[PDB]
From a paper:
Teneurins are ancient metazoan cell adhesion receptors that control brain development and neuronal wiring in higher animals. The extracellular C terminus binds the adhesion GPCR Latrophilin, forming a trans-cellular complex with synaptogenic functions. The structures revealed three signature motifs of the Teneurin fold: (1) the spiraling beta-barrel tyrosine-aspartate repeat “YD shell” domain, (2) a specialized “fibronectin plug” domain that seals off the YD shell at the N-terminal side, and (3) a beta-propeller referred to as the NCL-1, HT2A, and Lin-41 (NHL) domain.
The data reveal the Lphn2 Lec binding site on the Teneurin YD shell, spanning the tiers of the spiraling YD shell domain and burying a total of ∼1,500 Å2 surface area. We chose the minimal complex of Lphn2 Lec-Ten2 for a set of molecular dynamics (MD) simulations to assess the stability of the complex and to better define the positions of side chains in the interface. A 500-ns unrestrained simulation of the complex showed little movement between the Lec and YD shell (root-mean-square deviation [RMSD], ∼0.2 nm), suggestive of a stable complex. In contrast, the NHL domain drifted from its original position at the YD shell (RMSD, ∼1.2 nm), suggesting that it is connected via a flexible hinge. The results suggested two binding hotspots within the interface; one of these contacts is centered around D55, located in the loop between Lphn2 Lec strands β2 and β3. A second contact is formed by the β1-β2 and β4-h1 loops of Lec, which are binding to the lower part of the Ten2 YD shell. In both structures, the C-terminal Tox-GHH/TCAP domain lies ∼6 nm away from the Latrophilin binding site.
Author numbering:
A (entry chain D): 7 to 102
B (entry chain A): 1047 to 2798
The structure:
Amino acid sequence: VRRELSCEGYSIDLRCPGSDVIMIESANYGRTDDKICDADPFQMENTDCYLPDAFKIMTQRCNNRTQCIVVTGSDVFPDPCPGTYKYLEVQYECVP
Amino acid sequence: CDLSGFVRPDPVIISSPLSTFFSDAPGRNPIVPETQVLHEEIEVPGSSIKLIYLSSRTAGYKSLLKIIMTQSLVPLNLIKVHLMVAVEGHLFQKSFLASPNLAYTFIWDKTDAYGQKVYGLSDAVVSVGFEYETCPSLILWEKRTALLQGFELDPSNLGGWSLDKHHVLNVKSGILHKGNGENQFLTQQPAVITSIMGNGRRRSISCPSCNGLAEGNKLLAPVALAVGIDGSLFVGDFNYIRRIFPSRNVTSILELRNKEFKHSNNPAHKYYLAVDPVSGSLYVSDTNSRRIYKVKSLTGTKDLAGNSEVVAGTGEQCLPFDEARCGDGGKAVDATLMSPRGIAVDKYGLMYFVDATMIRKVDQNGIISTLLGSNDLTAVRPLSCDSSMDVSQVRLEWPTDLAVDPMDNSLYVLENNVILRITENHQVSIIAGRPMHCQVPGIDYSLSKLAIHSALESASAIAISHTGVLYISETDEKKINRLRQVTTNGEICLLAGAASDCDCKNDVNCNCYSGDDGYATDAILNSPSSLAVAPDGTIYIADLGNIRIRAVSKNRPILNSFNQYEAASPGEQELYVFNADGIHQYTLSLVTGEYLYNFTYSSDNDVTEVMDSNGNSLKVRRDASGMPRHLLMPDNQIVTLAVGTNGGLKLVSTQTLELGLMTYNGNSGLLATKSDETGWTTFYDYDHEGRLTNVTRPTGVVTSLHREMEKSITIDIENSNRDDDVTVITNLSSVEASYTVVQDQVRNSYQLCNNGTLRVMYANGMSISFHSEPHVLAGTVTPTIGRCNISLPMENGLNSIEWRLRKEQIKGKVTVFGRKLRVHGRNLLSIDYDRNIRTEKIYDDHRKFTLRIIYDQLGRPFLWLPSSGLAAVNVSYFFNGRLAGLQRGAMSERTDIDKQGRIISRMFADGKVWSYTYLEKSMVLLLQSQRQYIFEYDSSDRLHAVTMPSVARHSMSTHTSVGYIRNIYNPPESNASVIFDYSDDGRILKTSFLGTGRQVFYKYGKLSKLSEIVYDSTAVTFGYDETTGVLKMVNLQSGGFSCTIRYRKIGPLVDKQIYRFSEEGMVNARFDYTYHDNSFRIASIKPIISETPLPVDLYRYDEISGKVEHFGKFGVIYYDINQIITTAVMTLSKHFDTHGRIKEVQYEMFRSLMYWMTVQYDSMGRVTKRELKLGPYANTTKYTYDYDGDGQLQSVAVNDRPTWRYSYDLNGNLHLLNPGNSVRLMPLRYDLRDRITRLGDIPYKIDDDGFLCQRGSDVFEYNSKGLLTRAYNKANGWNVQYRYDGLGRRASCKTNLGHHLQYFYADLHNPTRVTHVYNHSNSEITSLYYDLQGHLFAMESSSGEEYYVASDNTGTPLAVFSINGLMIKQLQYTAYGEIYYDSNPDFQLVIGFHGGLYDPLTKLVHFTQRDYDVLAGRWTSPDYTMWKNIGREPAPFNLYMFKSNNPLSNELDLKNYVTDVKSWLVMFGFQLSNIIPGFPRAKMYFVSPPYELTESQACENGQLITGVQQTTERHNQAFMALEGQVISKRLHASIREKAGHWFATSTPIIGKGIMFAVKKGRVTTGISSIATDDSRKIASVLNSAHYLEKMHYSIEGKDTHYFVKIGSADSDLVTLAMTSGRKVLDSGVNVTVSQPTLLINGRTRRFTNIEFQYSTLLINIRYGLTADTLDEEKARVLDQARQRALGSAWAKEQQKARDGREGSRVWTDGEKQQLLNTGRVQGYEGYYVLPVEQYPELADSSSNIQFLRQNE
Ligand SMILES: *[C@@H]1O[C@H](CO)[C@@H](O[C@@H]2O[C@H](CO)[C@@H](O[C@@H]3O[C@H](CO[C@H]4O[C@H](CO)[C@@H](O)[C@H](O[C@H]5O[C@H](CO)[C@@H](O)[C@H](O)[C@@H]5O)[C@@H]4O)[C@@H](O)[C@H](O[C@H]4O[C@H](CO)[C@@H](O)[C@H](O)[C@@H]4O[C@H]4O[C@H](CO)[C@@H](O)[C@H](O)[C@@H]4O[C@H]4O[C@H](CO)[C@@H](O)[C@H](O)[C@@H]4O)[C@@H]3O)[C@H](O)[C@H]2NC(C)=O)[C@H](O)[C@H]1NC(C)=O
Ligand SMILES: *[C@@H]1O[C@H](CO)[C@@H](O[C@@H]2O[C@H](CO)[C@@H](O)[C@H](O)[C@H]2NC(C)=O)[C@H](O)[C@H]1NC(C)=O
Ligand SMILES: *[C@@H]1O[C@H](CO)[C@@H](O[C@@H]2O[C@H](CO)[C@@H](O)[C@H](O)[C@H]2NC(C)=O)[C@H](O)[C@H]1NC(C)=O
Ligand SMILES: *[C@@H]1O[C@H](CO)[C@@H](O[C@@H]2O[C@H](CO)[C@@H](O)[C@H](O)[C@H]2NC(C)=O)[C@H](O)[C@H]1NC(C)=O
Ligand SMILES: *[C@@H]1O[C@H](CO)[C@@H](O)[C@H](O)[C@H]1NC(C)=O
């Protein structure tokens, strides 16, 4: 298992060695912790912000690829909690 | 007489700067240049608390006031100039005659008119008068104010000295006087803005509940302000006039019936207030009612509407052209007013007011008149820009506010954005503002700090303080809403009100109210209408737009609910608590909140006990009068204190040691002399002003400080021994204190601004701006650097670092203190401390790093809990808080202490125990193997001798010499001395090896940086840029050969590196570097070797951690602490265990495993098992390692079968081994000095310096620098020559067998790392690639070939794989690095054992500073620098043994126990050095680099000579601090360390209490009270002598210094009480008087000779009468040195012929035979290579001699 995390507006970079390809294990766009991605008091107001389609979006964009770049924002993901400063948290593997 | 248009006096007043500067290390540098202050210290045993002396905390340190009253041009009619100075009741008066550039400097003794001491800060009133020839009776006067520093408070009362941790607060002046010498003038910090009345909401017109507390009390419209004689603030709150009492309570005193709620913000209904200073009467003037009123009762009666009485006006508005002149000449009550505006009341009680366009008077009798008489348009002349005209010539257009100057008694008028002054003599002049008369091009130079040259933008109000300071309110009502200050000198600056981005009147979504309870310059005001100055100097603002009254106050500590004062030091992370009298109660941690120090006093408030957090109490035992007797240390040790009759601390001593001996200059308190236990006496000289002028040392070195006090204060710093002249220029203004540090043409600028900003503009081009903010915990009283904006001279050179502080309060008490580090709006790290659970959480913003540090009940960190399942680190402490033990999983190291606090035992987790026994200054260290080391010490804990288990005794000594401190190490039973000569500042000057005569000379230039290195016939020069001061060139010159390294820099960063050679065949190199935008990160490296461009290597990083994500063609992946290096072809996986040690390496190529290694360790971290598979189909080999009782490698087994055996001497010398692959056991032999003599049957030869000389037939030639220049074997027919650069790195390798390689160092972070190799036989370049641990893993050729290297745990290459994944080379090494198997010997590998450069001919592995012998298993030379710290840290040691005879494991150090945040971060791949500019990079060196190499990297860092440079460094270091508290990771006792003193001090010739100075080769001596009679005899003889500069030599082991005296020895012979022979003094010093006869170049000469000698130090004096005496002695000493150089060179040449070794010159069979029989060769003579005329220090050097015939 490999881990990547990026705050809102920043890209997440996934890379596999040689000919190995990405396989998405888990993904979430939102907020599950009060300490991750520091901002105004309004950031820590919601630790139960989940996007069910985050796994589907990451799977479609990154699976079977040597590398993947995804921006943590409104251009790629819907908003599961407007007003709360979000982040994209992903767990993945490199398979043949 | 009438003086109109006459030149007014414009004096320039310069006050002596405040003592704000102190030293970071008073023991290293006691001189504070800017304030000419001496900052000294005395370290006491048993405590970390020091005794501090600051020369500014004395009576002798006077206050200065330079008054320049006249310039180069003098007015025509001027005849006399008068001066008046008023300070604390004193009145100095002096008359002078008119002269160009006339100036006087006033000296204040810091006393009042009653002769009593004045403490804190005082105000001086300077009056300058101009008497003209036209009128001798009248004098034109001008009053100006200046700030003078008074007496500083003495907290500790220890004879002028203070306790390091003991502070005091001056409550009246607002000054924090710290015991360490730090002074914090709190009132000089940024001004604070607060709301004293109003809440931003309007009250009802009826004023219900208006009589209560001022704070938060609703206002309607504050249009006028006036301060009463009581200190009360009268508020013109539109409808009502409300009085704010000093008790902070409000009561309505007068109601105005003509005011309606609708007209609140109407300018027509605006009225003006004024307080009469005579009687506290309040005058009201309403423009709308056309009258002036006086408040009857200031307490407020029942009927408030009728509490006023008419002073002037009837109520009717009179026409502009009135016949009766609106009632002028008669009673004011009966008169009529046009429109009364601003009112001001004179000192005499005279009332002045603005009436439409004129100024009218109302005298004591009640008669109205006109001061500025209008309607006289004919006599009116337009406003003169320079000259001052009478009231009659002045016309006023739209005048508003009016105020009296309480210092001048002059009237100030605010008229159409121009402030004018009406003097008592009725003279009018422009004070502030630029009229249209001389707008453009009135001033060609444009911008200046003067008020006359600065235009006023919509001014509304004016106020004048008692110090004559004018405050101007400016309101545009849109964006301009500010308060400006005009000082007595005429300078204008912003005091309050930042430029608002938003429109206050037009924009609806706007908030023009901010900055309250913060700094004034940052605050945003809204429509300021009126101003008033409080008695304490605070400025009140009628902030009409925000319906509030705001106060701009001096930054001061406020009395809390507990009747206590609080101040803090964020840099030291401390909070100081003082009582109501400013007496130091406690010192708490600013982070932890735990008590660090508790102070208890006597009945007379004299400090008697300092109790630390650990329970260590330092008691001050005192007399009934408060006089100190002694100090009772925490270990119950008595430190005797003797205070002299002058009140100065005379003696500080223990029962054995004399820690300090001092003498003072009379009753001034100025420290004259200071002596220690060694007898080293420092002499201090001051001027009559008490400013430090000279510092003389026993070395003869004098540091001089010269002050030139003009418009700018310049301090010149000079040294008698160096050409490093430093000059500091100080320019003090209203906005900032400007400093310029000049070294030749290299200028560094420093700016300390009033807003709290510190700006540095380095000569290199880089600028740093530190910005202050009030502390989140301590408040406005302590400004903190929370922002740092960096600028580099490049395209995208703007960088920004930020510290965001926060707090969590539960029930009014601090629970959590958070700190977040940010770079360009991104959080990198957060350090939060939770006081409730005592944990310090350090965490990343992306779940990558998490560390928790647990603190005990005493507030000490004891447990480090890391993430990723890593082994936790825990520590033990003794009762006194000293570190007892350390533990990291299974690894532990504990100690036991004495009742005296000395380590008696050392326990390891494997059961190993070391015992420490103390017996009469000697310590015996015994190991369980019964190996014994005896360390003999001084009273000062400095080594005298070291006895090894072999019973061989090594001896050491240190002595003060002429211009330096000499450190001598003598090997067992040998005279072959190893000497390290250091300057007074601790810089290396000379390294000498007396055995063969090896010498390395270090010279320092004009920038106080390394300029030259001279050894043998080689000269290395360091060139610096004349303007930027950066290192531009490094050139090595050895005869014909020249090696030049040139640099180009972007600020302090290298962007270009050039390599140039003078040799025929040698190729040149160029490396171009680029940096990532808005960072200090290297983005690319572009090499060009032999004019052949190579591919660019790109570098990619993680912006949050600094982790290298991509380098060249390689990509890096990080997971926990493990790393993966990937390519489309290869994957290199590195796995680390819980202790951060490598456990598995995996090298895959084309998805196939090429190499894998597994390392296993014991409890102590020693390698016990290693499994290796070299190749995809090869078998796996298991290696098992066993260690002896001392952790020395005993045996190595291959697949559980014993193959190698190792045995050791009592000294740790490897005396038994199985060489290479052999089963045969070979013995090694050693002499008394631990030098190898035999390896089996092969004899070894090590010279008298400790360097490898021969191994059988192999001959090795090491230079003075310790570098192998040549190696050959005549029998085997091979020869190898090496070339080195100026930084001590190997540049080339050339053999007689065709081999020729060149080495290049392109890595700026790893300067000793070989990155490129040029091969001359095929002309191809090899690029070397290293992993994150520094091990070689890949290679790339310029031909297109790619190689993949398999390296072990030590960085040793074991296998090479081709571009097609095929193993082409496989190597097998023994534990000590000897190759026994090589599958392909033709494939030449540059890097060998332990990552060094291996040579297959010599069998040596090269590391930049040392060479390692693979056959013997030891180094080829000793590291003599080991002797410097072996005394402080005693342990088993050997000068030659490799890695403590454990070659496969990482060297055991206390750094293995991770107890600091920066070290934990490094493990996780984090590189803070890449994200935080200036942050120290973690050193990746096996062998320490040479002095010049480490110096070339650190020279770009800012210098620390001056006080402003040290202030800047404190700002930088405090900004880079991570943990709130750092532990002292030391399992050894603290030793008092002196600069350049390594060993036990020898009795000096220049005795204690004797002054010795050598200025321009001339000797001067002085005598103090403590000096003995025999020491005074030496001083008397040495006085007026001339020293032979650069002509001092080491002759027969003696440190000889030559001197000359012009005259007769008769006078000096009477002093010595001898005629001839040798005499022994009380000190033991030998005095030898003789009359030698010398034959120098055919000339015979006889003279008297007096010689002073103690041990190796020899001082020689020659007597003569002629002027040529100095020139004759110079010619004599050089001829005698030439004889020594020639004698030695011919002897060495004869020995080379005898040994069968190659000589310096090619001799024929006849020439060689002549040399063997006679010793000399006919026709041949020795000549100097480096000229003796430029290099007199190499006059006796045989290595600087070449044999040549007369043919040349
Ligand atoms: C600075 O620059 C210098 C150049 O100016 C440079 O010096 C040169 O370095 C290269 C590389 O090391 C040297 O080349 C080597 O020469 C070896 C010597 O072999 C000679 O002798 C044999 C008879 O005894 C001849 O058969 C052989 O002929 C071959 O080469 C001819 C070219 O001259 C060619 O015309 C022929 O057709 C024929 O092919 C030759 O005259 C040579 O053995 C060596 O080859 C091995 O190494 C290569 C990689 O370096 C491999 O690609 C290659 O396959 C070889 O590996 C095999 O041998 C190794 C050693 O025994 C084993 O470790 C390998 O596992 C492998 O063994 C297998 O294959 C064998 C058959 O191929 C078989 O017998 C085994 O059983 C096993 O199955 C290589 O070509 C060159 O001589 C140097 N040049 C000069 C002018 O000095 C210097 O190093 C540079 N310095 C630095 C610091 O960079
Ligand atoms: C680090 O913590 C360990 C506990 O994990 C300490 O080990 C204990 O030490 C005492 C002696 O003071 C022994 O009696 C116990 O048996 C040990 N506890 C156990 C069960 O592990 C250790 O002393 C600490 N290390 C240091 C040097 O402070
Ligand atoms: C170390 O001791 C040796 C021997 O005492 C010194 O060498 C002698 O020096 C004198 C004077 O220069 C010569 O006349 C002798 O011929 C030398 N003796 C021999 C045979 O070596 C040497 O100078 C001393 N060196 C130091 C560093 O003091
Ligand atoms: C003063 O001079 C005497 C005589 O030259 C020195 O004493 C000699 O020192 C050497 C070396 O320690 C001894 O081997 C001799 O036995 C001593 N000779 C005599 C005759 O006393 C003495 O060391 C000198 N003083 C100092 C402190 O350097
Ligand atoms: C100040 O005003 C309060 C009402 O707000 C009143 O209770 C108190 O007595 C007054 N205190 C003084 C200073 O007299």
